[PDB]
Amino acid sequence: AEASADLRADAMAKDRSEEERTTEAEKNERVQKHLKALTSELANARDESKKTANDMIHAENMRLGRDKYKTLRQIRQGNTKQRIDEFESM
Amino acid sequence: AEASADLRADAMAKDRSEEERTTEAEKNERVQKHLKALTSELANARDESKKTANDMIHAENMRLGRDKYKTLRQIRQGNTKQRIDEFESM
Amino acid sequence: TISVRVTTMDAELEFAIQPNTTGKQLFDQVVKTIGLREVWFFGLQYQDTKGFSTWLKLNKKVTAQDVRKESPLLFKFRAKFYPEDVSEELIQDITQRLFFLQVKEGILNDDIYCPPETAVLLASYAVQSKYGDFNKEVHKSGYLAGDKLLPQRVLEQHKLNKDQWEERIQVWHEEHRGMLREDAVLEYLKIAQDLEMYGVNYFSIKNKKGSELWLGVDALGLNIYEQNDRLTPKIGFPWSEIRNISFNDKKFVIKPIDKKAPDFVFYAPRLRINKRILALCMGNHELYMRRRKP
Amino acid sequence: TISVRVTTMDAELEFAIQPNTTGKQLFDQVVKTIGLREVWFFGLQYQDTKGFSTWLKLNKKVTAQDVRKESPLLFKFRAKFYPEDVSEELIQDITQRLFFLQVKEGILNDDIYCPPETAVLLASYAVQSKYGDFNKEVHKSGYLAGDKLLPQRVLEQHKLNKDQWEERIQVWHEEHRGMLREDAVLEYLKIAQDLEMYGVNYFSIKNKKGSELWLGVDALGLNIYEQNDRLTPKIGFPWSEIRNISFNDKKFVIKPIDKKAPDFVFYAPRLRINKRILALCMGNHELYMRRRKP
Structure with a gap:
């Protein structure tokens, strides 16, 4: 029989790679199914008049389709001067 | 003719009176009508994806019927040891 | 000299x-x-x-x-201190003006959260106070171009440019036609005094377990707020329930009027802060009492 | 000795x-x-x-x-430092266990915000890890009575008592049947590392105009947060954009890699804080680089 094989180093890591990461829930169907189920099971037990500020920020973040990595990617846009100016304007 | 009049000091102030106060918008019908009008006028200019934490806290407060004086009343309920205990548990 | x-x-x-x-x-x-x-x-x-x-x-x-x-x-x-009610405690023109400019400054800089509808109604009163009755002859396009009418937050949330803002505000300016300047200032203060953060001195504090919280000191008493929510306090102590306040370095102790309740104790990050808290409690407590039994 | x-x-x-x-x-x-x-x-x-x-x-x-x-x-x-990815970087059993217990502690104490659905899923993995497979013989009514399964905030928002919570959690425990204890620990960490506040060191800081903000230092860079929102940062600097960091008393200066962009400067309330920020930036920067180019 016959066989061949090229030999080369395929460097997988990369600077700023964290900006392209996805969440476990997005890459793990079982975790995603579990969280969907838990959302249903708790819908009835939840007292909607007891929302903390973080609860409201979080729900709004989900409504707008935000995640940790997508936000990191987004907030690093622009050049250094633009971001420093936004910082001073905060 | 004839007239009579009883004479007595009717002290109107009172400790913790702030708890029973109402807002100007609740006691002023013109202000209340102005605010209602402004809510309509701005509804269509608002970018609903730009909501700060305070905007959310405020809208939830309104949803639940809160106001500065009603809350002051509510949060002072209970005795001093119960409130100090809640403080430590925060 | x-x-x-x-x-x-x-x-x-x-x-x-x-x-x-x-x-x-x-x-x-x-x-x-x-x-x-x-x-x-x-x-x-x-x-x-x-x-x-x-x-x-x-x-x-x-x-x-x-x-x-x-x-x-x-x-x-x-x-340094705010009245409990502006319409009963601010008798002079200079006093109302001073409180109005200071309060307006806090609203405009977002020190005092103010919702958008209220911020626009406040802006319109501030305009009537500054310009008097709208006059089509004097107040031409751009008459509000140099004014700080709204907090930046309100400007960022609405899809309106400077000109659209100034046209919407003009309509409202026009609405207060006939209202004296002093009455616009008073009306502004009546609405502003109802805001949750109005007249509150906030201080970063910690409980025994090290939880980060806010102590609010104002004309009415002492309030405790969650770190993330300065609009709605969770706990409150009216003045009449406090008999003595004091501090030992970073530790502050508030002694209740009785004996059964324990001492309300919290920790400030600096002694400087406790000194300010003490001065403020004393002043608001005195004026609170003085309004009731003079 | x-x-x-x-x-x-x-x-x-x-x-x-x-x-x-x-x-x-x-x-x-x-x-x-x-x-x-x-x-x-x-x-x-x-x-x-x-x-x-x-x-x-x-x-x-x-x-x-x-x-x-x-x-x-x-x-x-x-x-003191967190890996960028737990499945890649936490090879040993003792390492995983130590990170898991620490992370769990922050979730349970609400140092790291975690929404309710995720908090219950995490609780169930923590239960599988502690108890192994649910066993109707050993795990009778009340087996979870002495466990801190959820952050107080989650308990206060749901109209459920202790027993109802244990029953709901038991269903989920039962769901993970067959999962090794080490895999429950790792699954817990994989979900937890996606939380917005996970692995972030937060510091109270001010910009030139005195605005109160949060600096977040973590494994991936520097982030700036609005005072009220520690979940979603508004501005961020990746490590590869920073060439030097230093502080003079309260002032902290971050020099960018080029020349045309100004220094990123902020003010800490204490010099102690700036020393911690420096130590943290250096450590995270070094490990970040080390993972990419060993």
């Missing part, structure tokens, strides 16, 4: 004072000069040698306080 | 050290004793004389640091 400059919300005063001058003497010249009689709400603030905003003690000499050695000495005349 | 006690998340160690002992020698006994080779993530924390949580410098003597003179000296062994 020592050169001194005292700035109010809408006026600048220059005074030359002898080294012997005490805060109280300097304060008296300022209130005297501006024609202000409701002085109990006010104080003189200065930047100290360390760079901290500090209220000038009235019973000590100016020169004996850590004033930022420079010339002239710069002081800001501001309200 | 000096009496020392070092507590990890699930174990307590008692050491007797000579006065000559450095932080590095003490750290080596600890990791040696617990069988931990992935040491770079860890550190020893102590309460100083002043009462501040402080990381023991490894290059200095233990006695020459402001350790709270007492006996034994009390230290907490904890992760």
Whole structure:
């Protein structure tokens, strides 16, 4: 029989790679199914008049389709001067 | 003719009176009508994806019927040891 | 003589004072000069040698306080205490104006959260106060171009440009036709005093377990807020329930009126902060009492 | 000899050290004793004389640091740095367990915000890890009664009692049937690392105009947050954009890699804070680089 094989180093890591990461829930169907189920099971037990500020920020973040990595990617846009100016304007 | 009049000091102030106060918008019908009008006028200019934490806290407060004086009343309920205990548990 | 400059919300005063001058003497010249009689709400603030905003003690000499050695000495005349109700406690024109400009400044800078509808209604009263009745002849396109009418947050949330904003505000300015300038100032303060953060001095504090919280000191009492929510306090103590306050370095202790309840204790990050808290509690407690039983 | 006690998340160690002992020698006994080779993530924390949580410098003597003179000296062994990805970087059982217990502690105490659905899923993995497969014979009504399964905030928002919570959680425990204890720990960490506040060191900071904001230092860079929102940062700087960091008292300066962009400068309330920020930036930067180009 016959066989061949090229030999080369395929460097997988990369600077700023964290900006392209996805969440476990997005890459793990079982975790995603579990969280969907838990959302249903708790819908009835939840007292909607007891929302903390973080609860409201979080729900709004989900409504707008935000995640940790997508936000990191987004907030690093622009050049250094633009971001420093936004910082001073905060 | 004839007239009579009883004479007595009717002290109107009172400790913790702030708890029973109402807002100007609740006691002023013109202000209340102005605010209602402004809510309509701005509804269509608002970018609903730009909501700060305070905007959310405020809208939830309104949803639940809160106001500065009603809350002051509510949060002072209970005795001093119960409130100090809640403080430590925060 | 020592050169001194005292700035109010809408006026600048220059005074030359002898080294012997005490805060109280300097304060008296300022209130005297501006024609202000409701002085109990006010104080003189200065930047100290360390760079901290500090209220000038009235019973000590100016020169004996850590004033930022420079010339002239710069002081800001501001309200340190707020009335419980503006329509019953701010009798003079100068007093209302001063409170209005200071409150408006906090609203405009977002120190005091104000929802959008209210911010626009406030802006329209502020306009009527500054310009008097809308007049089609004088108030042409762009008459509000140099005014700070709204907090940045409100501008960022609505898809309106500067001109659209100034057209919407004009409609509202027009609405208050006939209202005197003093009445627009008062109306503005009536609405503003209902805001949750209005008149509240906030202080970062910790409980025994180290939880980060906010202590609010205001005309009505003491309030405790969750770190993330300064609009709705969770716990509150009315003045009548406090018999004694005191601090030992970072520890502050509030003793209740009875004996059964334990001491309300919290920790400030700096002694400087506890000193400010003590001064503020004392002042608001005294004025609270003085309104009720004079 | 000096009496020392070092507590990890699930174990307590008692050491007797000579006065000559450095932080590095003490750290080596600890990791040696617990069988931990992935040491770079860890550190020893102590309460100083002043009462501040402080990381023991490894290059200095233990006695020459402001350790709270007492006996034994009390230290907490904890992760000072977090991996970017747990499945890749936490190879040992002891490493995973230590990160899991610490992370769980922050979730349970609400240091890291976690929404309710995720908090219950996490609780169920923590239960599988502690108890192994649900067994109707061993795990009778009440087996979870002494466990801290959820953050107080989640309990307060749902109209459920302790028993209802245990029953709901038991269903989920049962769901993970067959999952090894080590896999439940890793699954827990994989979900937890996606939380917005996970692995972030938050510091209260001000910009030039005095606005109150949060600086977040983590494994991936520097982030700036609005005062009220610590979940979603508004501005961010990746490590590769920073060339130098330094501080002069309260002022902290971050120099960008080029020349045309100005310095990113902010002010910390204490010099202690800036020293912590520097230590944290350096460590995270180094490990970040090391993962990419060893």
